[PDB]
Amino acid sequence: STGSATTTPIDSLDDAYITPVQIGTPAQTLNLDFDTGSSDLWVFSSETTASEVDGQTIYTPSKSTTAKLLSGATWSISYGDGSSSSGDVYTDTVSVGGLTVTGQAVESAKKVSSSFTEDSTIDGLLGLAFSTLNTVSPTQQKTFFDNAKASLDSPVFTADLGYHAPGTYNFGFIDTTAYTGSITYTAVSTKQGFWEWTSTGYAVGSGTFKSTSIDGIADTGTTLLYLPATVVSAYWAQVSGAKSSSSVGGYVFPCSATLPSFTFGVGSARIVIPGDYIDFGPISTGSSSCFGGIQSSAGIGINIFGDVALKAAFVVFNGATTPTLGFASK
Numbered sequence: 548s549t550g551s552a553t554t555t556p557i558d559s560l561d562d563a564y565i566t567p568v569q570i571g572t573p574a575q576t577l578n579l580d581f582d583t584g585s586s587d588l589w590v591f592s593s594e595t596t597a598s599e600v601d602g603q604t605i606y607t608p609s610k611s612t613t614a615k616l617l618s619g620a621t622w623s624i625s626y627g628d629g630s631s632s633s634g635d636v637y638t639d640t641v642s643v644g645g646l647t648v649t650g651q652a653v654e655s656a657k658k659v660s661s662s663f664t665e666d667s668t669i670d671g672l673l674g675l676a677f678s679t680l681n682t683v684s685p686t687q688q689k690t691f692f693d694n695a696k697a698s699l700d701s702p703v704f705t706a707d708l709g710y711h712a713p714g715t716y717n718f719g720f721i722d723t724t725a726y727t728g729s730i731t732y733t734a735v736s737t738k739q740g741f742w743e744w745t746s747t748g749y750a751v752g753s754g755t756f757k758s759t760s761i762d763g764i765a766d767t768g769t770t771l772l773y774l775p776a777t778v779v780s781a782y783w784a785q786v787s788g789a790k791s792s793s794s795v796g797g798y799v800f801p802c803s804a805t806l807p808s809f810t811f812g813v814g815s816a817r818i819v820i821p822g823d824y825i826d827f828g829p830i831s832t833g834s835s836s837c838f839g840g841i842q843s844s845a846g847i848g849i850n851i852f853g854d855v856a857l858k859a860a861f862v863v864f865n866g867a868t869t870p871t872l873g874f875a876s877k
């Protein structure tokens with residue numbers, strides 16, 4: 548089997564991407580944030596505290612003939628920005644882009660933190676990291692991909708995110724029309740539950756390439772590119788007036804600037820992030836200070852190849868017995 552679904556930025560900054568997902572019978576379509584950095588599929592629901600729902604579409608398990616309470620199961624998760632959610636669990640039929648999993652754990656939120664309430668366009672998350680990170684207790688649950696994997700034509704999914712434009716998640720096949728040149732595959736470590744890999748270095752703008760190993764994760768659920776402070780300083784030093792602002796919480800730059808590209812290494816191949824992809828626009832409406840799309844990982848403890856990086860590439864998440872990641876230019 549295969550599936551293919553379009554993913555769409557939630558706002559003019561590409562802060563996140565949402566993908567329609569069918570849950571239950573008859574289908575209830577919710578727009579979920581596909582997150583290769585976590586492993587829970589959770590939704591706003593008829594159980595979510597009413598004061599914490601503000602415009603989201605909710606899943607109502609009592610209206611699904613295929614929903615079953617996963618008795619005694621609870622979940623509770625935090626994300627890297629400090630956002631969080633928790634609740635109980637149903638199993639139900641879940642379809643993405645024509646690919647169906649029966650008996651998928653659908654984690655129903657009883658509580659969500661303020662950032663989720665505020666994101667009226669995000670109806671929940673669909674985790675695509677390894678199932679070892681799933682938070683359901685006492686019986687850990689599998690991700691949608693892990694459940695689908697054995698049925699797929701090939702045990703893979705691909706992320707083809709757009710820059711201020713829609714893109715595609717495919718399951719089970721590699722669309723050879725979606726990228727240029729070749730896909731370079733690189734080894735993955737699952738030791739922390741992530742799609743964790745080692746970039747071979749970087750370049751800033753037209754500069755020469757610096758060969759250096761950068762361990763990090765491929766995370767569609769993170770907006771920005773978080774890299775070591777050394778690398779990030781070398782990038783922003785090329786932008787007149789750019790500086791790290793403690794009040795804003797990262798590097799800002801004059802909105803009058805034109806940003807250099809940033810290249811990262813995948814084996815002997817290179818992915819070039821255009822400078823425009825690094826511009827997140829005014830820090831507040833009307834400001835002439837713009838927020839940078841490359842930020843330090845120093846306070847996080849892990850480097851994160853988030854959407855800024857991934858949207859410059861066609862990315863293969865190969866979930867074969869020995870997992871790998873593939874990157875191609877596009």
Ligand SMILES: C#CCN(C)Cc1nc([C@]2(O)CN[C@@H](c3nc(-c4ccccc4)no3)C2)cs1
Nearest residue numbers: 582584585625626627630662766768769847848
């Ligand atoms: C701090 C620290 C160390 N580590 C926990 C950092 C990491 N953090 C992650 C993710 O929590 C998983 N992916 C990302 C994600 N955030 C969201 C999201 C958050 C709020 C609103 C909407 C979406 N969705 O996905 C970040 C992996 S490693």
Ligand SMILES: C#CCN(C)Cc1nc([C@]2(O)CN[C@@H](c3nc(-c4ccccc4)no3)C2)cs1
Nearest residue numbers: 562627628769770771827828829830831838847
């Ligand atoms: C312009 C503009 C809007 N604003 C002033 C700047 C922006 N801010 C963002 C965030 O993506 C939103 N959440 C923040 C955050 N995320 C994490 C984090 C992510 C993953 C793992 C660990 C930590 N830490 O802080 C930055 C986009 S534009």
